From a paper:
The recombinant subunit vaccines Bexsero and Trumenba contain an important meningococcal antigen, factor H binding protein (fHbp), which is a lipoprotein composed of two β-barrels that tightly bind domains 6 and 7 of human complement factor H (CFH). fHbp is antigenically variable; databases of genome sequences contain more than 900 different fHbp peptides, which fall into three variant groups or two subfamilies: V1 (subfamily B), V2 and V3 (both subfamily A). Here we use structure-based design to generate chimeric antigens (ChAs) against serogroup B N. meningitidis. ChAs exploit fHbp as a molecular scaffold to present the surface-exposed PorA VR2 loop, which is achieved by inserting the VR2 loop into a β-turn region in fHbp. ChAs retain epitopes from both fHbp and PorA, and can elicit functional immune responses against both antigens.
We exploited soluble fHbp peptide V1.1 as a molecular scaffold to display the PorA VR2 loop, P1.16 (VR2 P1.16). At each VR2 P1.16 insertion site, a single amino acid was deleted from the fHbp scaffold. All ChA scaffolds align with good agreement (route-mean-square deviations (RMSDs) range between 0.447 and 0.614) to fHbp V1.1, demonstrating that the fHbp scaffold is not perturbed by insertion of VR2 P1.16. In each structure VR2 P1.16 adopts a β-turn conformation that extends away from the fHbp scaffold. In ChAs, the VR2 N- and C-termini are effectively locked into a 'biological' β-turn peptide mimic by neighbouring fHbp β-strands, as confirmed by our atomic structures. SBA titres were detected with antisera raised against fHbpV1.1:PorA294/P1.16 when alum was used as the adjuvant, and with antisera raised against fHbpV1.1:PorA151/P1.16 (a low level of SBA from a single mouse), or fHbpV1.1:PorA309/P1.16 when MPLA was the adjuvant. Interestingly, there was no detectable IgG1 binding to PorA using sera raised against fHbpV1.1:PorA309/P1.16/MPLA, against which two mice had α-PorA SBA titres; instead this antisera contained significant levels of α-PorA-specific IgG2a and IgM (p ≤ 0.01 by two-way ANOVA).
Numbering used by the authors: 74 to 308, 308A, 308B, 308C, 308D, 308E, 308F, 308G, ...
């Protein structure tokens, strides 16, 4: 099987082992609200999570997308109810990781009691060892290389550069199947968030026009990694009505990159 060596069942069944390659644990917060249940399943194993529980990413492969079946549930006075089902994706780095949901079924709002087929893709948690804004490198520049992944497309390539003297970053997404998702990530400032985490929020561009927004956290004690997401907006227009109406579509992209080791001497 092509998933041999993926460690999916191991992730669902083993306790934390401090000998495993990091990131060892991914705390679930955005991925499962308080009071709900998230059931994951793969390779014959299953485990249910609540808000604050951690996934054992130490058992998964670095720099790849790991895939699990999921069922989102709530228990209401004795009855276990399905809210949503589909594929749960996890992308692991050494100091950071992220999750995402490919929905396939949701609760039906036109015929109550039923599940209905519906495809949608969203980002879950962005997790890891946040770099403090107040302890960043004081100068120089670093280049990060990694992955951009969206709905049915884990092949995108992320390049991103941070100038620590200017406290600014910029980069680009290449090689996604859908051409309008290969956007530039415009120059944007590093700022501290409410927990002093170093975070970058800016615009995305396509042939020089503004087409949405992105956010990246910086991770690791020495700013080794970036992780976060982008949102690409597309406007759709009527062609067959006298009334000119629009509809806006949003497509989400998960983002993760790392600095590469460079050839060096010890003398
Ligand atoms: Zn421990
Ligand atoms: Zn670390
Ligand atoms: Zn949004
Ligand atoms: Zn040399
Ligand atoms: Zn060395």
């Amino acid at each position: 099987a092509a998933d041999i060596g993926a460690g999916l069942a191991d992730a669902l069944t083993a306790p934390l082992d401090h000998k495993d390659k990091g990131l060892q644990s991914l705390t679930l917060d955005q991925s499962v609200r308080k009071n709900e249940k998230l059931k994951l399943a793969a390779q014959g194993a299953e485990k249910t999570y609540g808000n604050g529980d951690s996934l054992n990413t130490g058992k998964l492969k670095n720099d790849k997308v790991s895939r699990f079946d999921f069922i989102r549930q709530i228990e209401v006075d004795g009855q276990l109810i399905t809210l949503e089902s589909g594929e749960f994706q996890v992308y692991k780095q050494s100091h950071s990781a992220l999750t995402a949901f490919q929905t396939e079924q949701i609760q039906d709002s036109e015929h109550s009691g039923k599940m209905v087929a519906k495809r949608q893709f969203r980002i879950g948690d962005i997790a890891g060892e946040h770099t403090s804004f107040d302890k960043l490198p004081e100068g120089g520049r670093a280049t990060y290389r990694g992955t951009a992944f969206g709905s049915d497309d884990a092949g995108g390539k992320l390049t991103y550069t941070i100038d620590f003297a200017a406290k600014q970053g910029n980069g680009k997404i290449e090689h996604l199947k859908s051409p309008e998702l290969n956007v530039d990530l415009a120059a944007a400032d590093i700022k501290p968030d409410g927990k002093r985490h170093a975070v970058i929020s800016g615009s995305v561009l396509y042939n020089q026009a503004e087409k949405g927004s992105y956010s990246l956290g910086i991770f690791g004690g020495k700013a080794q990694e970036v992780a976060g997401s982008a949102e690409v907006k597309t406007v759709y227009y009527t062609k067959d009505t006298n009334n000119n109406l629009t509809l806006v579509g949003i497509r989400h992209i998960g983002l993760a990159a790392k600095q590469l080791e460079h050839h060096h001497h010890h003398h």
